[PDB]
Amino acid sequence: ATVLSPNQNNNSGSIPTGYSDLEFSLANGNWVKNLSLPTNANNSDKITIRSSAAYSSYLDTSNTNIPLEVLKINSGDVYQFIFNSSQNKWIAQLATVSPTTGSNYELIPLTTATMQKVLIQDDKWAQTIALPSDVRDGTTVQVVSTASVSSDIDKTNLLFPSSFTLKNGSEYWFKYYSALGKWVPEYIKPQKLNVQQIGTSLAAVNSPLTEIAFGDGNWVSNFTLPTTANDRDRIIIKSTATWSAKINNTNVNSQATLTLKTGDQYEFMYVSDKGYWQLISSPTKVIDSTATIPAILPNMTQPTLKVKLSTSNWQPTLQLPAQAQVGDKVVIVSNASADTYINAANGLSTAIKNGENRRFIYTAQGWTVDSYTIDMLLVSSPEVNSILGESAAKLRMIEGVNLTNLTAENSNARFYLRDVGYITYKIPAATLKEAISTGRDDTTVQNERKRILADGVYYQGNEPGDGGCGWAWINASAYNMIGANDIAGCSFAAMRHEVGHNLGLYHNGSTNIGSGFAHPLGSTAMGGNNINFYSSPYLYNPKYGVRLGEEGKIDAVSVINLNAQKISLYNHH
Amino acid sequence: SPSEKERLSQQQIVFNEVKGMVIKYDPKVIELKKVGDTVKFQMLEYGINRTGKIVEIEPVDQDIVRWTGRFDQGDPNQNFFTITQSQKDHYTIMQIFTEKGNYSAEIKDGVGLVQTMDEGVTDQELHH
Numbered sequence A: 001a002t003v004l005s006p007n008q009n010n011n012s013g014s015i016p017t018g019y020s021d022l023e024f025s026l027a028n029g030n031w032v033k034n035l036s037l038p039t040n041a042n043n044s045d046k047i048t049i050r051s052s053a054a055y056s057s058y059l060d061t062s063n064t065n066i067p068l069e070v071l072k073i074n075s076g077d078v079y080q081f082i083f084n085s086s087q088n089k090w091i092a093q094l095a096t097v098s099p100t101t102g103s104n105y106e107l108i109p110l111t112t113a114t115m116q117k118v119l120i121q122d123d124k125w126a127q128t129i130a131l132p133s134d135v136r137d138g139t140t141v142q143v144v145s146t147a148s149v150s151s152d153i154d155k156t157n158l159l160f161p162s163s164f165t166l167k168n169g170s171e172y173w174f175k176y177y178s179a180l181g182k183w184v185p186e187y188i189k190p191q192k193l194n195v196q197q198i199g200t201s202l203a204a205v206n207s208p209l210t211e212i213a214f215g216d217g218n219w220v221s222n223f224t225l226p227t228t229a230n231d232r233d234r235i236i237i238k239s240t241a242t243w244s245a246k247i248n249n250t251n252v253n254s255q256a257t258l259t260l261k262t263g264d265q266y267e268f269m270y271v272s273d274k275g276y277w278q279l280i281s282s283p284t285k286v287i288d289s290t291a292t293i294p295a296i297l298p299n300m301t302q303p304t305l306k307v308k309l310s311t312s313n314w315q316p317t318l319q320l321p322a323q324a325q326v327g328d329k330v331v332i333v334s335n336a337s338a339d340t341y342i343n344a345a346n347g348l349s350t351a352i353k354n355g356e357n358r359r360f361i362y363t364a365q366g367w368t369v370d371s372y373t374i375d376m377l378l379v380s381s382p383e384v385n386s387i388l389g390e391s392a393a394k395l396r397m398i399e400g401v402n403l404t405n406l407t408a409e410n411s412n413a414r415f416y417l418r419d420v421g422y423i424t425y426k427i428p429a430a431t432l433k434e435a436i437s438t439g440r441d442d443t444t445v446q447n448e449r450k451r452i453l454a455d456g457v458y459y460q461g462n463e464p465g466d467g468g469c470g471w472a473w474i475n476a477s478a479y480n481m482i483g484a485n486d487i488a489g490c491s492f493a494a495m496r497h498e499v500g501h502n503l504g505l506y507h508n509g510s511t512n513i514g515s516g517f518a519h520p521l522g523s524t525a526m527g528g529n530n531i532n533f534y535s536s537p538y539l540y541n542p543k544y545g546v547r548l549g550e551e552g553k554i555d556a557v558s559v560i561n562l563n564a565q566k567i568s569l570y571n572h573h
Numbered sequence B: 001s002p003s004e005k006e007r008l009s010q011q012q013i014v015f016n017e018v019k020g021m022v023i024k025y026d027p028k029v030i031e032l033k034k035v036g037d038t039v040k041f042q043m044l045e046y047g048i049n050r051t052g053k054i055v056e057i058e059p060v061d062q063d064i065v066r067w068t069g070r071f072d073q074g075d076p077n078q079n080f081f082t083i084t085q086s087q088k089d090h091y092t093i094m095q096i097f098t099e100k101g102n103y104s105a106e107i108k109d110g111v112g113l114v115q116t117m118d119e120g121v122t123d124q125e126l127h128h
């Protein structure tokens, strides 16, 4: 065996090729953060990675057979890979443990190794296997079965009681979160079905992730989801077929147009306490700023349509789709200088202006306004312009606006931010905390606010904050509609947080219903601000399925929707 | 901008490792990318190692251009990334939206900082 290390490898994590049996060791004085395996290699080459360093290392797994994107290497871990020319990948050799009693229930003993494999065979089988609780945080386990008689995993310590059944070919990856005391699914090998095999309906699901393919020669005209499943089971519906198909709305928590066109993909997730399939992913038809926009918008062939008006595709009037289903949404953005009128069959008649985002939703009585435009005045301190640059400072605030509108749109929040003015000015204040106060009376910013009819004002400064880099009045009147962040410690993601305060939201743990949702698998804007959502009991974590709120206790979107229009009318024509 | 034997260099990696994660960045790599070219992100400490393709290049003004792309193996309906870059000030902002998390990158004069969006704001509730 050949022993190598970063100091013996030009202080690089690129494990070199040419060795039939290589051992790459990491230590406290000999360490690198990012590691990778060589692409060029011979068939039976062996590489073993060991680590005794206090700092963790991370391995690129793009040329391996591990479905995870990155491997976390800790002190005491021993990873072994064997190349394979037939597959052109490094095959991992994980510590394997198997059930040994042919009984109905067996607890699986796990070591302290970060990555382990639980493997079920014909001769090593159990009706129900249980993963142990309270193991080292971050422990990742691959559960795989090659047996011909099926088994399943005990659901007590699993994040959700999904259909974790194990047949020949099943593969589930779990990671234990001590903050939750639960094994959380990180990768689920999908059960693939051709719709020609099952027809126009699926009576029941067999695994946590079912993938139904449509194609030419494999196609039906309509498809009905199961009436029931286990909690957080998922169904993905894909099409490569020429001719469209319809996903029936029965058993789904949506009346929208679920038309399955070429290249479309839909994802559904069952919710036990509600008893239906939640629609968590659906296509959006986009007519962008370079494409031609029809005067009469096309009939809905998917749940959402977004139209991007520009100077080169400007249209004087737009007619909302004549045929649609309840829940269908139309989002219109305008970067053209002239206005565009929007009309619907029910008599709805309005206009969209330059820089404005507008969303409409279809109801039983026609199209309906689904968003209110809050005009904002962007103020940048000259100190910030000197550090970032005149153009850069404007760029920083615009990205804050775009992220806020993206977060609001993902949350069904009925508001968009529109910047109607940008001024360079220093609010007289020694601190950011002081600036948020005097900015309400500052003659320079308030005259400009009135001149351009800005519903609110936002300030980007370089003053030190008194215990934090952002400030904003909570549930702000027209007089208090102001928010601020700095550049020292706050990024452009702070705007959607401060504007949330202006809209009436509090941090997680607050007694108010308009508060954030904090969770180790993803926290909303007011409750940690690491996912693009405001909290709501009708929103779910895209990857893990955790409900982002609670009916009557944690619902930020319900408070936003009660204040959005009132704030949008602070300044008007 | 014009040069020889180097303009052909088309690396898929956008930035390189060296509160958050310090990175080095070359603004000339993205400026040589056209609609359809492949772009790669490496944030191994955050568990992100994936590629993507440029789908949209949009001039936002005379000085700022925005690149938009989608990832090859994510969720095609939700995941995407944006690179918005000013030329006059060597300043670039990146929005990387994946199902595993959201990451922002703020770069100035070739050096930048990537962090999870939870690091983007810390503040206290303000009272009267």
Ligand SMILES: [Zn+2]
Residues within 6 Å of the ligand: A497, A501, A507, B123, B124, B125
């Ligand atoms: Zn706050």
